[PDB]
Amino acid sequence: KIDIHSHILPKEWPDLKKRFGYGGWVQLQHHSKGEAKLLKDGKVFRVVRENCWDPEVRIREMDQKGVTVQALSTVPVMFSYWAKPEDTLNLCQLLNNDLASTVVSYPRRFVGLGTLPMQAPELAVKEMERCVKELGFPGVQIGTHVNEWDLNAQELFPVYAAAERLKCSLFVHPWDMQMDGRMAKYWLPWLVGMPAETTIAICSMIMGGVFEKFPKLKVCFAHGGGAFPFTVGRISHGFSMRPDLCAQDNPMNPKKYLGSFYTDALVHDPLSLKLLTDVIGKDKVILGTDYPFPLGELEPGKLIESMEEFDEETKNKLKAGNALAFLGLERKQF
Amino acid sequence: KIDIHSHILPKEWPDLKKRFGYGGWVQLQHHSKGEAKLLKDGKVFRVVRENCWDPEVRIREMDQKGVTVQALSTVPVMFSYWAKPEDTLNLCQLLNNDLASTVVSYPRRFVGLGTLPMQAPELAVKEMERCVKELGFPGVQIGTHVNEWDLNAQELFPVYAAAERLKCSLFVHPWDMQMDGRMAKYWLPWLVGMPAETTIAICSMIMGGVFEKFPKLKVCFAHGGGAFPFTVGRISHGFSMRPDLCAQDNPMNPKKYLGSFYTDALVHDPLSLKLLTDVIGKDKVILGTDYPFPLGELEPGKLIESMEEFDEETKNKLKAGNALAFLGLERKQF
Numbered sequence A, B: 001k002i003d004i005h006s007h008i009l010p011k012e013w014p015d016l017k018k019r020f021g022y023g024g025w026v027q028l029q030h031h032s033k034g035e036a037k038l039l040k041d042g043k044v045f046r047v048v049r050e051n052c053w054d055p056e057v058r059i060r061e062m063d064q065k066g067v068t069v070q071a072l073s074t075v076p077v078m079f080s081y082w083a084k085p086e087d088t089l090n091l092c093q094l095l096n097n098d099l100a101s102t103v104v105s106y107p108r109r110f111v112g113l114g115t116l117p118m119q120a121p122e123l124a125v126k127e128m129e130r131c132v133k134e135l136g137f138p139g140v141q142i143g144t145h146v147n148e149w150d151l152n153a154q155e156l157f158p159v160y161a162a163a164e165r166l167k168c169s170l171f172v173h174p175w176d177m178q179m180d181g182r183m184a185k186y187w188l189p190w191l192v193g194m195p196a197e198t199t200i201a202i203c204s205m206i207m208g209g210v211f212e213k214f215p216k217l218k219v220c221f222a223h224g225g226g227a228f229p230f231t232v233g234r235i236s237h238g239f240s241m242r243p244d245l246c247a248q249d250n251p252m253n254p255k256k257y258l259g260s261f262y263t264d265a266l267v268h269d270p271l272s273l274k275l276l277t278d279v280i281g282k283d284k285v286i287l288g289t290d291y292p293f294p295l296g297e298l299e300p301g302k303l304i305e306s307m308e309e310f311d312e313e314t315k316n317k318l319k320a321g322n323a324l325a326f327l328g329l330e331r332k333q334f
């Protein structure tokens, strides 16, 4: 029904080294029909298909797979938290506007998840205010960390305060793992580095008092919380054993916040999905696909259809019900 | 009945900075009765009790907790893979001999797992052969990586080949995670760094072809494999979707290796333990405690015994049966 985890790019965008005056950016080249390359200062790193930018193609594959709504967000490599703040804000506004146009073209099939200049919180609050009031976005997508800041950093608290005030949902996506060293092999940053990033982000928001200070803030973590649903016992036990190290910014045990945030259902395995629903809750698991990248779910929702343990009310919660709750929307997409 | 995961230190050892000519080593200083300080070049990093060195104290606690046998291994901070090879080997002789003398004093309560100078595979094979033949150890404890080498590195294959031949089991313990920067907070190196170090180690051994090339090698991973039982779906899926990044040293899928290695049961929560035996297998999960450190299990086997889902045959496999099969020992312990 609803896919909370899908990425989209504009059909094109200007040379960002020319626009801003320094390198490190991502561009897009239509080298042949139906395909395109993603470059970084000339060096290609991935090839994408038409479904990465063309909404016409996405709607076709959405009807084919049974998907009703896609929550569109940018590709996390575009976060650009490393750049100068004024330049990231410029890029965020470019990416957010293209999202708004794609959503208003098919308001029954798309919702928008914006991008924020997280390195400059005063600018990110303003761009969030524009994303909610003007662009009508139900939420934004942010990384699991912002340069040397984990999501516990006090500098980020005005952004959380604004998001809780604006009723702006947060989708926390892992990015900027170590790409070299020992991690330059076996696709380790994707297979292991990204789940570790999400686990760090969950712990950092819990022990940083984020969920405590902003109880109404609605957060969702990608890839089923990473390793958190399995390692929560170790984390919870460690908090109890060393409160001098873990209980200084927030005194509550991390298990208290089970049921205070969401994760997506992208775990590929039924055993992993059952533990996910068992630990996080049947009301806090949302169907996500990572469309259109191949590391995601090929048949959206097939893993939830196959679970004989879930009743039909629970399947419909993971397929679409929990997405509506996290986004703060109603059933207006028949 | 059997605890495969417990650490012990010698009561004393000389000034290592003077023994080897450089700093960075660990010293044990007794400041009070029943307590001692661990120093890294004068700076304390934890206070330990007498049960970390005194075997008499361990015996009393083992009787009171119901533990028949402890597998004694050194504390991973003593791995010393960063130092000169001939100096780390010097330390391995000191640690393994002291480990050996504690086993001969109570030979039905202890078996030894020696330490090796893994940064010099040729010396490691020598000292390991000495451990098995001259000292009688059924295995050794090694880290999840040796400097820039992961456990897939072909430089370490002489260690694996000697292990299959000598019938020497490998207990792989996470160590040398990032300790500073973003990880310097909330005990993250132990709560998140250690499980991730172990997940990387399982992936490197699988995708490096270690289990295929040494099918009789007996390997056990610590802390329930870290994140592997929960994220094996994503790891297996990422292997099939990108054979050009993962399948260049071993074409077999990671799922085919569920059942080719052991993990301990140190996962603290019932749902984590049930998933652990669902993925790794009821015959490949071993009771481990991390004695005497507080992050471990205070009452060994209490979690296993409380599992209503398990039959008595399964509980005995986790309590002692799987440890004996992994260590390759018979019931010489009454």
Ligand SMILES: N#Cc1c(-c2cccs2)nc(SCc2cccc(CC(=O)O)c2)[nH]c1=O
Binding pocket: A007, A045, A046, A075, A076, A077, A290, A293, A295
């Ligand atoms: N290596 C490598 C490599 C790279 C990069 C190298 C350096 C910077 S990005 N990008 C891609 S495209 C899909 C994508 C790109 C960026 C973030 C995400 C988050 C997710 O959906 O999982 C997915 N595919 C690759 O294999």
Ligand SMILES: N#Cc1c(-c2cccs2)nc(SCc2cccc(CC(=O)O)c2)[nH]c1=O
Binding pocket: B007, B045, B046, B075, B076, B077, B290, B293, B295
């Ligand atoms: N931070 C910090 C910190 C440190 C260190 C800092 C730098 C080097 S060690 N050591 C201890 S003592 C038990 C122990 C020490 C070393 C490895 C293991 C593996 C296991 O869990 O069994 C346990 N406790 C701490 O909290």
Ligand SMILES: [K+]
Binding pocket: A138, A139, A167, A168, A169, A326, A327, A328
């Ligand atoms: K919202």
Ligand SMILES: [K+]
Binding pocket: A119, A146, A147, A148, A149
């Ligand atoms: K920053």
Ligand SMILES: [K+]
Binding pocket: B138, B139, B167, B168, B169, B218, B326, B327, B328
């Ligand atoms: K053995």
Ligand SMILES: [K+]
Binding pocket: B265, B287, B297, B300, B301, B302, B303, B304, B305
């Ligand atoms: K137990």
Ligand SMILES: [Zn+2]
Binding pocket: A005, A007, A173, A222, A290
């Ligand atoms: Zn994604």
Ligand SMILES: [Zn+2]
Binding pocket: B005, B007, B173, B222, B290
């Ligand atoms: Zn340990």
